[PDB]
Amino acid sequence: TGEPEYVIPDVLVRKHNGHWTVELNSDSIPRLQINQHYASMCNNARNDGDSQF
Amino acid sequence: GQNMRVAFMPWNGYNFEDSILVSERVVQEDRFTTIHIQELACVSRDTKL
Amino acid sequence: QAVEMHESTISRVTTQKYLHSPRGIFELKYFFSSHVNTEGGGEASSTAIRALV
DNA sequence: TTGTATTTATTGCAATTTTCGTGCCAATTTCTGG
DNA sequence: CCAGAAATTGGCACGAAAATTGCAATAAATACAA
């Protein structure tokens, strides 16, 4: 009983148009984003204590 | 389907409530024999080891 | 030398990172190996010698 | 017109530890002549 | 068949080269007040 365990690659290599090309695995590339709500909350007329934070 | 020689009569309760009585000669002539095909698959993958 | 960086950066980048090729899944550190001499004057990797053995 | 405060752009050096190939030789296994 | 000789193997050692890890604030560009 049991099952094999796999590993997710980080870079993929394939032969295209007779030459080898290398790309990143898009399923595992980490990415982030800035929350636009709190970012747009930066009002100058608002209290400085919140603005500096 | 197939063309069958049929009689309309009761036969000892073997066609009671939509039952059908069939001759052995029908079976011996392969008149309602069918062919069924099934598919099986084996996949070889790549592991870390 | 090829990518114009320091050897420490190359060492750190290629750590616990994998690559998928039509032949299999290899760690990025699998492609660095020592060598011995050759009668012609060139060099032969230790991986090739192990495969030949 | 300029000197100055604020924001992007910097992904290497230097010890130190680890791995490389290859020689020496004790212990072990294989070989051959009388 | 026997026993000495010869080939085989791997633990230890040597220097040399290669890989790993600690170090924590600045250079420069740009917009603003006299």
Residue C18: DSSP 8-state: E
Q: What is the resolution of this structure in A?
A: 2.7
Compute φ and ψ for A48, nearest 5 degrees.
-65, -30
Chain C residue numbers with beta carbons less than 8 Å from the beta carbon of A14 are 22
User: If DSSP states are collapsed to H, E and C, what string results for chain B?
Assistant: CCCCCCCCCCCCCCCCCCCCCCCHHHHHCCCCCCCCCCCCCCCCCCCCC
Q: Amino acid identity of B33?
A: T
**Residue bearing tokens 């148009």:** A17
Residue C31: DSSP 8-state: G
**Residue bearing tokens 């970012």:** A39
Locate A28 and state its tokens.
Answer: 């595992």
Distance from CA of B42 to the nearest CA of C (A): 19
Chain A residue numbers with beta carbons less than 8 Å from the beta carbon of B48 are 5-7
3-state secondary structure of A21: strand
Give the angle subtended at the CA of B25 by the CAs of B14 and B19, to the nearest 5°: 20
**Residue bearing tokens 């099986």:** B40
Task: Round to whole Å and give the CA distance between B7 and B22.
Answer: 11
Nearest to A40 by CA among A49, A32, A50: A50
Q: Which residues, 6+ apart, have CB-to-CB distance to C45 below 8 Å? A: C33, C34, C35
